[PDB]
Curated annotation (Swiss-Prot), chains A, B:
Changing N433A: Loss of helicase and ATPase activity. The lineage of its organism: Archaea, Thermoproteota, Thermoprotei, Sulfolobales, Sulfolobaceae. It comes from Saccharolobus solfataricus (strain ATCC 35092 / DSM 1617 / JCM 11322 / P2). Changing A401R: Predominantly monomeric and loss of helicase activity. Changing R344A: Loss of helicase and reduction of ATPase activity. CDD domains: MCM_arch. PANTHER family: DNA REPLICATION LICENSING FACTOR MCM FAMILY MEMBER, DNA REPLICATION LICENSING FACTOR MCM4. This is Minichromosome maintenance protein MCM. It comes from the Archaea. ATP binds at G325, D326, P327, G328, T329, A330, K331, S332. A motif (Arginine finger) lies at residues 457-460.
Length: 589, 589
DNA sequence: TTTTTTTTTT
């Protein structure tokens, strides 16, 4: 009614950034350079420019937003006429709204308003095409005319074809012409409330969201996203009666963000510390007294070695950890911590997981009737960490399903007429108890660990945690009580920035192995194998996998400090933690 | 015959509460401040002010309620004109009326009248939106005018669109405009009759209830509620012919209360008793001769310690109790009691429960065809108590499914392509028999208890109940016979108010640990660990869990006395019952 | 036919 297009262009051209940079003229120019079709504007900036326009953007979104998009398209097309004939429509995507609604707490009064929802994305569909401007043909030996049907408008959520020909005025048959039809990319996804938000004793709620055009395929299942958009009622057949006055809610999304500049500077400044490795290790599960070898090993597992992908084969880069320990030894608490700190992790329990749930499930969809594949835990954990607590509670017949994923990092299935293989490039961090609950030193290591060697060799480090009371006891109790009282530790790396640091290291640091490090690894591996032949009753074998583990561990020691080369220091650190592991499983060098 | 709006406004503004407080203008102020759209009035106050108004409220509800709501809306908007343009309708929810029909016993003549139903809420749907005034648009190259269709009325339970356009007079197709459409929150729930109401040998009946607007999400599954409302007939498709002359009954809810003020003074005055802990303990299972240590343990488990939720981890606050005893030692009876007295509790049997039924089940809902998550017992008991009777009757391979819930207080599953973890912050109180039905004193404690160390360490206190005949026998018999005769115990706390006291204490009392109590706990814990290192054969270990249990128990003794600090007395009481526990399983100190 | 589940059943 009162047009804001000039207001919007003045906002774009003149809104000064932080250093008088013209934040949005820079974003516009960069958009045109890379030919991206979507301009993101912060809502706080709009409220800082024109309060009235910001109100219209939130409350009258459906119609004020395309007008702004048209003004932006015109301005862009003046800036560079070559945008025409490449992109016909741009988007004005509003990000960072003031108030976020908790998914469960939306009510009637939130429909039609532009709102934000924070939640975990659990499911997406393939990419489809939605018609927004149809072109029909009246089949009749008189008309035979093509016409755009959603005239002066746009095709609604429901699909409706005309009943009266607007080109002649005579009813009849209408055939859809796909040649002269205009479509937009379309994807349905489901987001559910953050686990910390689910009320006591209830199950998490879900909400269906719709992503169109360049929003399609912008996040993977498991990603915690912050969607901005508009709510509406889900119509499956509303033109017919017979009760059913009730509807579901969905969000048409205009903006989405997952999980970023000062963070890089901070992680770099952190890694200038000559003792940064010790810092990270002491930052691992800080409310747990002791278990430094385990904190080190878990930190290594967080960082991981370097995967080698070649012309014929590929070689695993991820580090697997196994902690077999007495009851009450902070195992599950540490595993909970690393699932929290890791940039991408999945938490599973040996008794809570199936063979199919951990790898891939073949589910018979009761709709079409046909069989389809669903990603299990190790596949969703691709690119991250999968934690298997209480791994001795898995059925062995179920547990062997992860052997392929642990070494070749693929889950390959051939079932119900479908043959496929998925990537399960996930690092396994596992914990369990010995055969008799606690470790029994009176018995050989073999019948006490009670795991096959085929899976033991898959583990780079295997520590046996014995809970033996000694002089440590008093210290322990004091530490625990200080934890209960609320006395947190100082000079630590907070879990969020530790996560950001791990993510950066994994994304950007690929350490190369130096010759001196390679010589130390070979020499220690030979010594390892010679000592291993001395006790063949041990179910802990020394295989080429252990040489690869020395590689991966030294690579991760380098990675942890952000180093681009694996120097002698990192090789020695690897040999030493390896030697600790071997001492615990009863192997003296 | 009398304009009841003036009477109602007089009731609100001038009704003196208990201490001449003007109860309802104060409730109006709180409602207007927090911008809530619903004012609760007790029916007894209305009957105490104006019998004729109360009679009109219950008997002539259908028309009297909107008039009163309009009067209240006018008054509210006079209090704060900013209420305008935020909320157009207020709610007058009358609570506690004396027209309470038992669920099974409703009949025809009770339809249309305002009645109350006391029952357990078992199932709810997600929160949906029911249209209550649609706005259509006539699609035709001549009309194209917008109009609200349910004109001069409101959309009925069935959804009906017009057949004739009122803006032109021409029939055709009508498009729903969700923008100009009016919606109300909608939620279907199921309530079933109280177990004391279920006829002999039959199954409990159920009834469908509908909660709209702010009534939505006002109770969780498991809650015993008292729903007030009006009954009506269920319509799934009634406008078309073809048989189906029979209808189901449901309640449109207007008011609901779960499970409330002077009780605070009652429990506070109770807590001034210098021996209040002994009173509570003697109020536990009053019909059972002896077993006072178990009664104490159950009282502690009812109260529970303080959970610590920190930056990285969280630390369990609930107290787990295990009673392993000879047959016929009043175990099941005491457990039944604590399930009755606990403000929220779940009762299960080792042979009656699954590993999936106790934690969480992956159910293939045959409607959507896809796999769905269902809360098991330990998840439903979040924030309360779950009692596992006959726990020795579980398969061990099934029982380990609760280990995670017992320590980390989450049930996490990964199956059929879905990964989730729910909160299971419930205290487990379990009982079972020894390996040989009765305890065998000629055989070691290890194979007599017949439980893994991994589950035993999860239990803060484990009592071995032997039924050995001595001088106790005659006293026992006399107590039993008096119980049969109907001679109840004096100087007792009735179960209903003891439940209320427990509720208040758990909700509001967070005991802090003093330095002296912490030092006492540390010393005793070190003594425990040395004494345990003396006995390496037992299945009862001493792990960090036992130190955490001393923390929880002393915290709970303070909580039981409503103390805000953990004094030396509470630490000493905790240490002594721990010492008793250790004596029963066989450790002298 | 696969999968989780409770159940009767090859
Ligand atoms: Mg554990
Ligand atoms: Mg029994
Ligand atoms: Zn025509
Ligand atoms: Zn019309």
């Amino acid at each position: 009614q009162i047009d804001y297009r000039d207001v919007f262009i003045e906002f774009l051209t003149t809104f000064k950034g932080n250093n008088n940079q013209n934040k949005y003229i820079e974003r516009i120019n960069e958009l045109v350079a890379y030919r991206k079709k979507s301009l993101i504007i912060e809502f706080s900036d709009v409220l800082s420019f024109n309060e009235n326009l910001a109100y219209e953007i939130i409350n009258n979104t459906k119609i004020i937003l395309p007008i702004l998009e048209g003004a932006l398209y015109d301005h862009i097309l003046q800036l560079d006429p070559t945008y025409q004939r490449d992109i016909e429509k741009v988007h004005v995507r509003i990000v960072g709204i003031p108030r976020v609604i908790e998914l469960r707490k939306i009510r009637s009064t939130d429909i039609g308003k532009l709102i934000t929802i924070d939640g975990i994305l659990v499911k997406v569909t393939p990419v489809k095409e939605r018609i927004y401007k149809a072109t029909y043909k009246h089949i009749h030996p008189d008309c035979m005319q093509e016409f755009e049907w959603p005239e002066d408008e746009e095709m609604p959520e429901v699909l409706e074809m005309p009943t009266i020909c607007p080109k002649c005025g005579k009813p009849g048959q209408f055939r859809l012409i796909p040649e002269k039809t205009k479509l937009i990319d379309w994807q349905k996804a489901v987001i559910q409330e953050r686990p910390e938000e689910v009320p006591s004793g209830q199950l998490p709620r879900q909400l269906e969201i719709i992503l169109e055009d360049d929003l399609v395929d912008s996040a993977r299942p498991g990603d915690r996203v912050k969607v901005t958009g508009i709510l509406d009622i889900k119509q499956d057949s509303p033109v017919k009666r017979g009760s059913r006055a009730v509807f579901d809610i969905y969000m048409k999304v205009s903006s989405i963000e997952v999980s970023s500049e000062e963070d890089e500077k901070k992680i770099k400044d952190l890694a200038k510390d000559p003792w940064i490795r010790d810092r990270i290790i002491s930052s691992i599960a800080p409310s747990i007294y002791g278990h430094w070898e385990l904190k080190e090993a878990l930190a290594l597992a967080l960082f991981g070695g370097v995967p080698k992908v070649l012309e014929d084969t590929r070689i695993r880069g991820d580090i697997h950890i196994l902690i077999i320990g007495d009851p009450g030894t902070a195992k599950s608490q540490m595993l909970q911590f690393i699932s929290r700190v890791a940039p991408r992790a999945v938490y599973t329990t040996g008794k809570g997981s199936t063979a199919a749930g951990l790898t891939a499930a073949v589910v018979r969809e009761k709709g079409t009737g046909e069989y389809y594949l669903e990603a299990g835990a190790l596949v969703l954990a691709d690119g991250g960490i999968a934690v298997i607590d209480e791994i001795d509670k898995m059925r062995d017949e179920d547990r062997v399903a992860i052997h392929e994923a642990m070494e070749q990092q693929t889950v390959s299935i051939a079932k119900a007429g479908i043959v496929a293989k998925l990537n399960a490039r996930a690092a396994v961090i596992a914990a369990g108890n010995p055969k008799f609950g606690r470790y029994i030193s009176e018995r050989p290591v073999s019948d006490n660990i009670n795991l096959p060697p085929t899976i033991l060799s898959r583990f780079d480090l295997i520590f046996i945690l014995k809970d033996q009371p000694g002089e440590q006891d008093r210290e322990l109790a004091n530490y625990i009580l200080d934890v209960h009282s609320g006395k947190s530790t100082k000079n630590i790396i907070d879990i969020d920035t530790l996560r950001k640091y791990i993510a950066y290291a994994r994304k950007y640091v690929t350490p190369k192995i130096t010759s001196e490090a390679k010589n130390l690894i070979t020499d220690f591996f030979v010594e390892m194998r010679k000592k291993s032949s001395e006790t063949p009753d041990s179910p802990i074998l020394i295989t080429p996998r252990q040489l690869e583990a020395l590689i991966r561990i030294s690579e991760a020691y380098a990675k942890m400090a952000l180093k681009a080369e694996v120097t002698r220091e990192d090789a020695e650190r690897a040999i030493n933690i390896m030697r600790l592991f071997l001492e615990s499983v009863g192997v003296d060098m």
